[PDB]
Every structure is written in C-alpha cells, then in structure tokens.
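Please predict the structure of the following assembly.
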Amino acid sequence: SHHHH
Amino acid sequence: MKNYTDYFFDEPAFDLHDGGYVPLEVSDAPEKPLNVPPLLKPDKETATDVYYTVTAEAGETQLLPGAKTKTWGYNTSLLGQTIVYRRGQHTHVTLKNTLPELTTFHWHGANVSGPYVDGGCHAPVYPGESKHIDFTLEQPATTLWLHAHPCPSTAEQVWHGLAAMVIVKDDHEASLPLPRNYGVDDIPVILQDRRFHENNQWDYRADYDPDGVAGPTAMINGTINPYFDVTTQKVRLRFLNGANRREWRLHFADDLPFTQIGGDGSLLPEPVKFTHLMLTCAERAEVIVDFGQYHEGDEVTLYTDDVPLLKFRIHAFKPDQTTLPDKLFDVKAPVVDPALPVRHVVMQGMDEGVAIDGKKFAMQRIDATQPIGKAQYWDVTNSNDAPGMVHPFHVHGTQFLVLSRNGHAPYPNEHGFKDTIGVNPGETVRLLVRFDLPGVYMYHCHIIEHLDGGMMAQIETFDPA
Amino acid sequence: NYTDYFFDEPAFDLHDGGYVPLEVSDAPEKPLNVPPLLKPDKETATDVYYTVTAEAGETQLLPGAKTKTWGYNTSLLGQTIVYRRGQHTHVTLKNTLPELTTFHWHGANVSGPYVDGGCHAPVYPGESKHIDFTLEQPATTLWLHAHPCPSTAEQVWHGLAAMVIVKDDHEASLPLPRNYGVDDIPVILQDRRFHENNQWDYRADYDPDGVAGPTAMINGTINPYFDVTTQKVRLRFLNGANRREWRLHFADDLPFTQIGGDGSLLPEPVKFTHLMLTCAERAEVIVDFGQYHEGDEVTLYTDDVPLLKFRIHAFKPDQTTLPDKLFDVKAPVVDPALPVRHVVMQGMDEGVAIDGKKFAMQRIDATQPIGKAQYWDVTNSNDAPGMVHPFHVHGTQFLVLSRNGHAPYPNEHGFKDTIGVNPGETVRLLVRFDLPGVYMYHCHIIEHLDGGMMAQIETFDP
Ligand SMILES: [Ag+]
Ligand SMILES: [Ag+]
Ligand SMILES: [Ag+]
Ligand SMILES: [Cu+2]
Ligand SMILES: [Cu+2]
Ligand SMILES: [Cu+2]
Ligand SMILES: [Cu+2]
Ligand SMILES: [Cu+2]
Ligand SMILES: [Cu+2]
Ligand SMILES: [Cu+2]
C-alpha cells in the first residue's frame, strides 16, 4: 500500500 | 527517496497547490468499456493520395445515467474519429461546420503551412460553410491531435468536446516491434476533466476561471469510469492531455513499470523506463505497458495522484518475447545559424495579467520574424513564481528540440522532437527551433484559458531570397 | 384593413416561423429604472474626462435569485453618457469582465477602427485603453454596446448597452423637455428569456435567425411604471433587442410627436399614433398628457402587450408648442465621378451574407474617398416570407433618399445610421465619411451580424 503526494 | 517527488517537474509548482485547485472525485457512474474512437474511413485513398471529410457537429452523448449531455465532436457527437495521416502522402481534407458558432480546425503539431492550413486564429469557418485544405506531411511518425482554435474562445469549444487524436505513420516506425493493432493493443488515452451540472450538462461559463478551468470528474476518450480489456501481453497507450489546465500524474496502483517510446513530435531516441509520468496540457506520451505478471481476472488500475482513472481487465494472452531496441530513432539535430541571435520569449503574469513579452495577443500585430530553413535558439522563460504554475509553451508549425532547463539537462523523456514543453515557475528552457514552411504561426501557453486571455503572440516566417 | 405602421405588414416579425410572442410577466410592477448620468472625472468647457468600466454583477429583475448581468459602470446596461459637440472628449475604457470585449459608439462620427470600437479594437480583462475624440455632429441619441466579432449578440444579451446623449447649441435653444429623469427619459426596449433561478442563457435560446425572449425589459426593468410630473414628456426610444421589432402605441391612441431619429433632429415634427422601430433605430418623441388628471394611468404598448405604465400626477400647464422647423438638413451634393454603390443583403439563417460573402477580419470589401457623398443602393434580397433587415454603417450619418423609387417614410428626412429594409426592397442612401479609417457595414439583427452578414469599407484622403 502506497499513497501519492 | 521519501522526501522526493516521483515526477520530473518542480513539486511546489504542481496544480494541486493552486489556490482554486479542484480535486478529482470518483464518479458513481457505472463502469463501462473505454470508448475507442473508430478510425475515420477516407472518402477515397490511393498510395499517393488520401481524401477525408471532417465535420464539426453538435449532438448528445450518454455520459452519466439520466439525461444525455450536449456535446460537440468531429464526425461524431463527442471528441472525434481518429485520423490517420502518412508521411509523404498527399492529403486532401474537406472541413465542414454544422455547429451554431464559427470554429477553426487546428492540427496541433502538424508541420503544415499557416495561417490557413495550420487552422489557427486566422482560419475561421462559419456555420453551414465548407473549406478545403491540401498538404503533405514531412515529419516523423508520432501522435498529433485536432482541436478548435478560434481566438477566442478555444477553451469553450474544447470544453464542448472538439478534440480528436491524429496518428501519423511513417516507414521507420512500421519496422519497429510495437503494438499497432488499433483498438486492441494500441489505444488513445485522451485525458480530460469536466464538471457536470443539473441534467448532466456542461457549462463552461459557470465554471470559468482565468487561471484555468478544471472539473472534478475525469473523462477518458469521452467515457466516465472506463475499463479496458487487455487481450495481449504488451499494450501501447497514446496519452494526450486534452484538459484545459489539469496536469496528470500517471502511475499504476502498484507502480507497474512502463516504457515511453515517443513524445509530441517523434519517437524518443531511446526507450525510457518509468513508474511515474507527469503530463502538462497538450503533451503526448506513447508508452508500452507489459501486463505479463498478472493472471486472468486481475484488474490493474491506472491512477492520477490518488484518484483511479482507467481499469485494465486482464484476460488470457499469448506470451510476448519481443524486446525494444536500444535505439528507436535517430535525432538529426540541425546546426544553429550563427547569424541569428538568441530569441528571448517571456511568459508572464497570472489571471487577467497573462501576457508574452509585455503584451497581449492582437490579431493584426506580428510580434516576431524568423527565416525558414534556419535553426535558432529560443530561450523561453516562465516569469511567475512563488505561487506559480507550470506553463506548457507551444509553437505552431514546428517540432523543436529541448536543449536545456535552467542551464541543466532536459528531462529524460525530452530528447526527441516536441511541440509543447512545460516551463516551471522561474525557469528558462532553451529550445532549438526551425520552421520549414512560410506563413504566420502563433506561440502561446497551452493552459487554454491563458490562450484566450491573450498569452499568445505570432511569428512570421519568410524565405530570404 | 390597413396597418398603422410604415413597414410592410407581411414582413413583420410576428409572421416569422419561429416567432416568440411577448408575454406579460407576473413580476410585480415597480418604478422604471432610470440609469443615472455618468459623472465625469473632470469637466471644463473645452474638455471632458470619463471612465467607462465593463463589469459583471447581479441585478434583481424577478423575485427570488438575482440575475447575473453585465453593464457599464453598473450591474446591468449602463449610466447615460453625455457628450457635447466640439468638446474634446477623453475616455478610459476599462474591462473587468471575464472575457474580452469592445466599446462601440454606435452613431458616433469618430475614426476607425480603434476609437470606433468595432471588431478590431479588443480590450482584454483587466486591461485599460484610452481614446480621445471630438464629435462634430448634431445633437441626437446614440448608444454604446459591445462589438467583438463574434459574439456581439451574446454580450449585448448579458446586458452591455448604454444610452449616449449628444448635446449641441441648436437643440438647447429649442423648447423641449430636457430634465433627465423627470421629463426626459431613456426607453431602452429589450426582451429576455428567464431560465431557472432567473438566469439568462444565450446559448440555450440561440437561433441563427435572431434571438428573442417572451419578457419585455425596459431599462433593465420588468413591468415598469413611470411617475409623470409634467404635461410634456420626452421619451428617447432605443431598440436594443437582438431581433425584435417594437410597434409602439398608447391606450386611447394618444398622439405623440417624433422630434429626432438616429443622427439628428427631424427637419420638421411628425405626429404619430403608432410607431415601429427595428434593431438599433432610435426615435425621440414628445408625449402630451394635457387631457389627463391626477391618478390617470396611460399604458405604452407594443402590439397588444403593455410595456410601460405612465402614472399621471398634478402638473403645471405647459403651453409650449414645437416650431414648424426643428432642424435644417443640409444635404451634400453627390460626387458625379463616383458610381452608384450596390450593397445586397442576402440569405437567412446560416446562409446570411453581403454581396455573396461572409465577413472576414482580413478583407476590405469596399473603399470610398472621405469628404465625398455617394449613393448607396441597399437591397434586402430575402424572398417572401422574409424579415425587415436594419442596415447599419459605422462612422457616418447618412440621408435617406428613396424606398423602391418612392418617398422615404415620414420620419426618415433627418440623419440616420440604421434603416429598416423590407423584403425585396432597395433603399437609396446618401453616404459621406468625414474621417479616414476602416468601418463595418452590416445588418443589426445581432445574430446575423455574428453570422457574418457584415462587410468593411476603407475610407482614405484623395
Ligand atoms: Ag507510486
Ligand atoms: Ag497561477
Ligand atoms: Ag428570415
Ligand atoms: Cu493545441
Ligand atoms: Cu497548436
Ligand atoms: Cu495554438
Ligand atoms: Cu450598433
Ligand atoms: Cu455601429
Ligand atoms: Cu457594427
Ligand atoms: Cu439581418
């Protein structure tokens, strides 16, 4: 799981 | 690499920092197959000549459940049928306008004559009227596009749906190992956003903002909540930022790699590997995605930032052992004319203050001249800072090369021919610019609201004899 | 069996296929809005200095939400601008709209194409421009409106129009009502269609043959009444509609006297019971309420639709009477070296054109030497059923010589800048340009203007 910004 | 952005552009200048930024929101609309604009069938075609009719028209399109949205399009109700051109092929196009407003037919990135064939501000076509144009492209294979370009309002007409992808084929690109089965393993991905109001209608005037118009709903090839059925291992996506102002920060949910093979004006010299790609207005990027690690039934989603855009449903496919060459295309860089000086172009201002070289566009005034056949250094500066935006600088009737960014190397994907380049706040980029044909050509910011707000000038090219 | 108007009844808008009848709104009656006089920045006898700002705002027209409108130094329409013959006039044009516009002084003898403020004189949002001119023309009513090419129609619809009064010595010596807002009022005649939340939507109502809505709007007012406190009232009628014709008469068929048209006082006063105005025509009339008493109400109509209620109050008797001669019209001699110019307006809908072609920003269609009067034969070629087309020419005030080889209408012996040409009809005009420049000529059904029923002429010094 990785989020962007 | 945790304190760093994954994109090449300056992170403080990103649109999401803008005072009036409009975040994208996922729509509740149903999932449906990505609309793939069909190829426009020529009226007639030989090996030497091709004949087309392009008709701008008003209609309705089911986009959201309920009432149909009023839209404009080319040979269809929204966007347009994809138009194939060939290098060296004599092309004959009949332009027809069945809109209730006058319009223009601009072939963005097409090295054609101006100001008429180029179809910018000086090529109006009234309701009911037809025009004829003729040209032969002497340019590499690449992805271009067509859109309305009255001065003004280009913004309004693009919002009412007037854009279509134009594919340019050549012999060199045909010989490379690339997905090329249009609709199956090679697809347009026209990236736009809209705001739907009551009755699922658009209203450019209500949403107007002088620093760029942006809606919360993404729309890909005129589709809300699209999915695409993958039936091959490798897929080619022809990305086009057809938005008024929004930037797209593209990446798969799981950081699946993809290889960029082409930009605005040509194949890249070498393939460039990406997990994250940012595109400013009017930029094109052609990428190969390899889905070889996924199983049948899997669904891989393409994101902008944290918002899902396009879902890839993975079916069974034959293995693909093909592999891209180290080199895709030979970039023959012209020598600079020593006689010519450095041209300085300064994009300046925000909102209503937007200008170039201290002045707003005027239809009648020629701002600059340059000889044909002779290459010149253009230093192009985005003047605004602090609160700043990345300004996509575009020049009609040419394909330039990017030499430097603030004295430093251009971005990894900028070593080919481009017609639009994102200039960061405070930045000077150096282009190498040569015009082949005589005529009047504009250059401008491609945030379309800036274009309409006068952030535009025109250059006259002449034969020195 | 006979129409009371001068024009050809078959060609009246009300026979058009897509005719929209006016309907009286249910909105409450309210005082007629009288746009205030624009206060100058500075004024001497020799110079006047004005700031004109195109701005976007909101106006209460119907109950509920405010309508989103444009205006000049106000939210809708504009403050009345007073110019004086022979006074050096300095105007700052300022655009605080969200799109580019133009400042056209319809009927002003000024230079073009910049001061004139036509297609070629854009002003971008946030920008300013400076113009300087001196009017050398007789007293009359003109107006200001937007004129981008296109869309003039859209911007006029948004509300960009304002009355311009040109004063002079001769008119000042005449016995006319002249107390602006008490016995001398603008009557700007428009129509609109109100959509949800009382908003306008030009694109929704668009029609290439002319845009009309069912709700009359007088000086940016719905269902107006005006309090009369004098025996004599001067009305300055302006047809500021996109397409619609006004067929004006009072209850009781109360007479009224026309004293002026587009470009000048009429040579002689002309008594009417019924008067028809096409787009951009102006007519100044004197109404006499001598027969009426306190509390009497006198309705101004178009066709059978009430527009404006005059409420009579007690007034001082006014026993002035208009001279037999208001104004001396000195007709120039036609230069015999010059040919007869033939201008043909043709087509309907998206086929509208002039002399077989649509307007092009780049193309000069005509030339004429300044200081030299020339016959223009202007033909409306539209087969019956057709429209009355109001032909307009920038930067001049012409004289009307004939209609189909016959006398012009009784109110057409003065100077005019707009003339209603009937289907099939050829009118001969006498046209002289004083100043050099580039000037448009076109139909003033505004949608036809935008649809390219427009050409341009260059005037030069010999
Ligand atoms: Ag990522
Ligand atoms: Ag900004
Ligand atoms: Ag008609
Ligand atoms: Cu473009
Ligand atoms: Cu372009
Ligand atoms: Cu352009
Ligand atoms: Cu006018
Ligand atoms: Cu005019
Ligand atoms: Cu005009
Ligand atoms: Cu007309």
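Chain A has no helices and no strands. Residues C 104, 106, 392, 394 surround copper (II) ion (ligand 8) (CB under 6 Å).
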